[PDB]
Subunit: 260 residues, 4 copies
């Protein structure tokens, strides 16, 4: 019986995800937004406190990802490619700026499972972003000044987020786009009677990323809306205003995770 | 904060699945099959031994499920309805006949997550079965003698199982269809460096079903094949012989789980 | 080459749909609704006029279908099963009551193609309805008094319709359900430059159904709303009030189609 | 009653596709292949004849497409993005070399409808290709020598094509059949539209083109005939970006 996640199996192939290293390359459409500080604070786990400078600030990201491990798994895009929508909210952890992730949606089950292991609270959704093609022409925006990119996310057949950015200038400090570490919550419940309120796993974690790289980073303006949907709470973080729109490529490897 | 599974949230609505009770009503197309005893034995976890009488016997099931909890969630079929394919394999636990579930596929993420909590090693797949309609006519089989029903399962765009049954007569003892208790494995890994081989949760469990009911049960003949697929190991349990085909409605409630 | 729809092929198997007969068995959750008479009239093709008694009335249906033809195609549910949401609107054709279908959504491409051939203006969508299971218990409504059934439709990831019905009693006259014949529009455009407004096929048709049967028909109360969505116009027929809710099984065969007027 | 395709509507918004112009930008992973000449010939419509020099040759393409029209429709990727797998087969038209398209699969209904209008015999499928990301790293190949790309296509939950290319080195009109049947009794063998057409592309552009080696197989599937053009051997694999606009179609 081999495997990292279920199903465990004789050859360790059937598992939804094998053991790390997990490698990632993606393209991000991002929007800085501001919600009610109290609404953001309401989502925070016990160990985190509101950001004393930017409470209410968040970032919405729509990402086209490609995953691989040690065996050129990216040659199997029917399993290795997925699209993802998440928000993070500014917070502090012991006086240090961090980014809490309350909600995140993906269109792939393996990504969802790798997510839960990392503490990303992933559910299935349908996510899309405008793509730039280097050939150019009227079927594509330019990845440069004036380039417009749309993005959307749905869950259970309901639209939950719609966004648009217009690029203006290169990001002068690309590496600093990843400055705030992400905080997550590994959580796995119990089903034994009497224990439904006593999860087997429940721990605050900090995302650890190896060999992070950012390229082709652009900044501009942005529009963003969250839409009310049955069975979702994203829109309870209403967009009071939008800040910068961002477009960049992102790569890293995951082999570790810090339990806080 | 509130909720049973992730994401936890201010109102406990965004969670992929709320706490039990979980109620189920389903229609099952079932096929008894026989594979190599050694191939079946290779899938067994520590704690289970080969069945001394029927090693190699298993049952493939294709199910059209509807879920609900305490608030008429069946009124939201976009979330509550799903289709599922699984196999069980005859085994023994401490000299008692049981049914081990190595592989199971479902077309809904909430069902998948509830599955992991139960120890069902669910992955996403596309599952279909012929339906009988009371109105009759050339668009439907009869739920009765001569009625033919097809069923298929795919995962990652690859067909993994194809089945057909032809009904002959009512099941003589419908209550006995669910006689072998199902054994599963709750399993949730760690990502902390050095601990990828030390899962946080790893325990054999017995499925506990409340108020189990079966109706409209028919038996007849069957054909079943498992197809080799990249990233799957189902077809490593080759169908050497097909036994009985079954068609029945099934209902039960989940509130508990027995850790062995 | 062989085949009925594209792709045509050496063996006539690859086609999205073969020739009729097309057989259908389905379960319907239906809602009678009332919108603005002028909104309904705005969708009507040339040839149809407003209903002088019930202008603004329509019916929304959510259907779990199973298709088959001459070879037990229902044994291949990955191709033959699908879910469908449509509306019809009361109208008149030369003084006769008919039902115009402006919008319809389905989760299966073969159904979409067979639809286009019939003049049903089908697009892809995601459609669901609560199911009743004979075994009973807390996972299912009863198909009977008090039974509640929800239904929804989305397109392109946007929710466009949400419905609920509560059953009260058997339909008194099931034979008279959806008694208005359905009118559709076969339409296939041209792409040749200069001809983008000169479609190759453009004709009003009346749906012809063979051996129609209904069973297990119940009526009760209903709630229905259409939701605004980008790239959709369904919600421009706002539900001002709802009438009866319905639940029934439906079966028929298609082999024919009546052309009313070409272009 | 405005609109280009159905549904026609009061505002012309609900239609599956509006009128041209239709603009496209895409990335192609492709494989040249050789099947049995007689198998290719069996797919040919009236009006096309076997290629006297390369009968049996075809090309398989897996494409990640983005569409737009006159209103920045590419800002709505939930409708405007799609993935497509097709094959073409070498043939001749009136003594002249062309590429016949017998089979093609897309993951989007609007693309399927625009396809039928063009005479592409599109059905729904699930199509995927490896993507190259500029940022680089172990999650992506690098366009250039040694760069490896996989691609697959499925239909009705069945895998029908699997391909892989390895790039080595930097670097025919399509014929289709518009076809729309009749349902009126007695007329099921008498289609309302049935005409051979040549694809007309405006402002075509190709960029960043690479060729290399390739593997390709078509898998037998219920309800499909693609694998009845068995890949006997593969030629070149290739990778490139492609753009063009559609406003016209030539009836032959």
């Amino acid at each position: 019986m081999k495997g990292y996640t279920v199903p465990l199996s004789p050859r360790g192939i059937a598992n939804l995800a094998p053991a790390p290293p997990w490698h990632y390359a993606g393209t991000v459409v991002g929007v800085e937004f501001f919600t009610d500080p109290a609404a953001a604070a309401a989502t925070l786990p016990e160990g985190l406190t509101p950001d004393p400078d930017s409470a209410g600030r968040g970032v919405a990201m729509f990402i086209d990802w490609q995953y691989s491990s040690t065996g050129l798994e990216y040659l199997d895009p029917a399993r290795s490619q997925y699209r993802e929508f998440l928000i993070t909210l500014d917070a502090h952890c012991n006086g240090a700026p961090v980014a809490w992730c309350p909600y995140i949606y993906v269109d792939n089950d393996a990504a969802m499972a790798r997510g839960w292991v990392q503490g990303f609270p992933k559910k299935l959704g349908a996510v899309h972003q405008t793509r730039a093609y280097s050939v150019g022409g009227p079927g594509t925006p330019v990845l440069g000044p004036g380039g417009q990119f749309g993005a959307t996310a749905s869950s259970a057949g309901q639209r939950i987020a719609e966004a648009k950015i217009t690029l203006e200038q290169p990001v002068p400090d690309p590496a600093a786009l990843m400055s705030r570490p992400v905080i997550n919550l590994r959580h796995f419940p119990r089903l034994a009677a009497g224990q439904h309120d006593q999860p087997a796993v429940h721990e605050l974690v900090m995302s650890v990323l190896d060999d992070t790289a950012v390229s082709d980073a652009w900044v501009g303006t942005a529009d963003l809306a969250f839409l009310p949907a049955h069975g979702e709470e994203l829109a309870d973080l209403p967009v009071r205003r939008t800040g910068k729109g961002f477009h960049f490529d992102l790569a890293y490897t995951v082999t570790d995770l810090m339990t806080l």
